[model samples]
Structures are given as C-alpha cells and as structure tokens.
Target: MDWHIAKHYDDILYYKAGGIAKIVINRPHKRNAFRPQTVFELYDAFCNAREDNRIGVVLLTGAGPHSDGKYAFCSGGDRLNVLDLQRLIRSMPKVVIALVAGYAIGGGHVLHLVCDLTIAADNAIFGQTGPKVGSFDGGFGSSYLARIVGQKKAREIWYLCRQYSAQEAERMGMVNTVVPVDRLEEEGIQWAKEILSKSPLAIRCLKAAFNADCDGQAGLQELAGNATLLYYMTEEGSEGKQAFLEKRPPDFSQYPWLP
Candidate 1:
C-alpha cells in the first residue's frame, strides 16, 4: 500500500491527453467500490473536465485487475452517488462516456448508465445487486434504464440481478460498442476523436434536445440554457452586453424582430 503510485489523489486518477479527459476510479483493492471520498474525487475531477474548454469528451472507468487478475469498474455502495452523478452527467454540455472493463456491479452499473454513452470490453461484466444487497436507486437507475432498454428488459435486469456480458448488453441496447479489453481505451479514443470532429454547438443543441424529452422542465432548462448561450453569440445578444458595458441607452432601433 505504501508503494502505490497515483497521478491525482489516492482514490482517483485524472488526465487529459489531446481533447479527451479520462477520470479513473483508482481503487482496485476495493473492486472499485464507491467510498464517499471516491465520489468526491470523481466529482472534482469531472467538474474540472467540464470547465476546461479544451475537453470535449470525458471517459469514466475503474482502475484494473487485482494481483489475482479479477477486473472491476464499480463494485458497490451509496445510493446518492447515483443522483449526484446523474444530475452532473446529464447537465454537462459535453459528452460523457463510460468505459467498462469488468465486474461493473450495482452502483458501478449506474455510473455507466448515467453517462451519455458506454463502451464495454468483451471481458466486462455488468449487473445490479440492489435487491440482493437490499438497496435501490429509487430514481434514474430504473427509470432512465427502462427508457434506454425498454420496460420489460429493464425489469428483467433489476428483478433478476443477473450479470450480462458486454455483447449481451449491446444486444439489449445497454452498451454502445464492445471491443477486446486491450483495445478498450484505444476504441474510446477513436470514438472521442470522431465525436470531437463535430461542431460543439450542434452537439450541444442535440444533446439538449434528446435530454429535454427525458428531462422535462429540467430538460427545458438545459435546452433554454443552450439558446441563452447562442443568444450571447449573436449581435442582437451582444448588443445588450455591449450596451450595458458602454453605458448606452441600448439601441433596439436597428435590430429587427425575428420569427
């Protein structure tokens, strides 16, 4: 334990190479289980990623195999970790991806579910342990999951508490893509690069649009927030800021009302 090396803190590691920011859960001994401190570090790292304009994509993953060679993404605990991460991930203007390599159980499964996309390694394992563990998310875990995979399968997932393979998850519409474990990060990088090639505004608006239907007023707020961002980019919107800054009466005379 004394010899352990880390880039950020003891529980997490953060890095940005190119446009992609990777936030990793660094606790292999715990099977990448959620500790309050782990969530705190993750939130801080993700927040930093969001604020950095250079970062267009954020990838969330767990550390790695134990000395015995068992892999994990998020093994278990703290239901609120679900809500906190759900709001943050959904509210982010940029894309969030979950790169699941193995043993993503319970809360770990929720982490990936809340991300905008998920990439699972062929070796990855996914399931929820709530019923057996005697806790439930009570919100996004079931609701949003059903929305993604439809009601029956979603029910099957939660009710049965069975583990699903990466390919099985994709067939059920849970994961976006699967690759060999060694190629997982590379595949994520490839996808992020292609996604980064997209217009920021186009992606933002589309993100808002899709989220809006799921989000309702909260969705509208994010959607409205986008319009607000665009408005500031316009001469019409800039006029207000410039006028305020220059102490002018605000010229509304030249700008026409638009449809």
Candidate 2:
C-alpha cells in the first residue's frame, strides 16, 4: 500500500496508506501532552479516514521516552484542553487502533481505551495519573476501561492512579500485545496492514458489531455524569483551572475537601 503524509499545526502527524491511516502524537517536548486542538486533529483525521475509501484502519502513537527506557504513549490531555478532548472521544468512530508505546497516562490512557485495540511496547507503562496531579475526573472515555477490564480494574486504575507495565496491561486484557520497544512501530504498521487486508466493508461492520455488543451504554452515561460532577463540584477541578490561568502550582490544601 502506498502512503502519504499530512502534518497539522496541532502537534499531530498523519500518514495514510492504501486503506489505513496512522496518527503520531508529535509533541515530544511536552511528552505529547494534548491541547484542545490536538483532540480536534484526531477527530478530523479519523473523519478523513472514515470518508476515504482508501483508508480502513487508524493507528495512534506518542513521540517520546520516559526517564526509564520505556517510551510514553500518551501522558493524558493538556489539563487546559480537557473538555475538548472529551467531546472528541465521545464522538469517535470505533474503527481505530491505539498503538501505545511508553507512558499512556491519564488522557493518553483514555485515548488508548477509546480505540478498538491497544498495542503497547514491552516497556510501556499505562495508568491514570490525574489523581496524583490533583485531578479527579478521567473524562468521557473511562467507560472503555470498564468495558474491557471490568468495573473493579477500572476503579483501581483511576482511584489509585497507578501505572501498569505493558505485560500487566496485557494480562488484564487492556492491551492486545506487548512487543519490544524497538519493534513497536514496525509491529503496529504490520498489524494495521493485516487489518486492511481484510474486506473493508466487513471490517467496518465488525467494528460496529463489536461496539454494540460491548453494551457500554450504562458505563458511558456514568462517565458523563461523573465527569460533569467533577467539573462542577470539585475544588481540585477549580484549582486546576485557576492554576492554569495564573501559571502557578495549585494550592490543593486550601480546597474545602482537604480541610
């Protein structure tokens, strides 16, 4: 399959093959922290893939490494762009795979969950680090975890904000495979190609069937409600917003909940 490259100003890199598309989170400087527009670019890229007959699969990845040899797949959303990230994921089509390498923390973790499959590098670490950062909400895509890993695992991941290695993630059924870091991109592309080798129409139909069969309606509703409540009722949420605006460390101790 032939491939073409497209770059957007939103720190995302896109490449389209015969019937597959790949999106690379390109903000190595910020460890691929997503801004509001990053989510928009994702939506746009997926829509493009959905519309183009030549595109059948979508692959997503991050662009850097952690202090450890492992690389981070996603560090989560830019706290500044949380709402936009939610809107984008809530409207996403399910025919995409999240190719996670490195750390897929917080927002990045949610992004991987939203995809049909998650393939991680052997050294990758996945988790919800938002709580450690003083954020309580996991946003709209949290349901994907509940659906894939069960309610209990989802709760532990979000509540503890702990990181799990790729092997651990795979054991929990959260990841499809855990390959060596150096083979991540190559294996991801091969996997995408394998999917594209199938009948495109059949693949799309299967994606729809899988999503429907998962029966995540209740989970989605819960995620929406929880996110809304967190946004409106949490002192940490407010502190996060204010700190971003003021360009300072959030003084979480002053929040009513702490006292």
Best by TM-score: 1
- Every model: Cα RMSD to truth: 3.4, 16.8
lDDT of each: 0.86, 0.72
Predicted structure 1: lDDT: 0.86
TM per candidate: 0.93, 0.73
Candidate 2's TM-score: 0.73
lDDT of 2 by residue, 1-259 (tens): 4557854546788887666778888877677888777777766776676677776677888877645444667787674255554444434443577888778888788778777788888878888877689766544456668878888998899888888989999999989998887888788788887876776545544554555555477445544544565475566778777888899987877556535
Q: What is the alpha-carbon lDDT for the whole of candidate 2?
A: 0.72
In model 2, pairs of residues that clash are 19-54, 19-56, 71-102, 71-103, 72-102, 72-103, 73-103, 76-107, 76-108
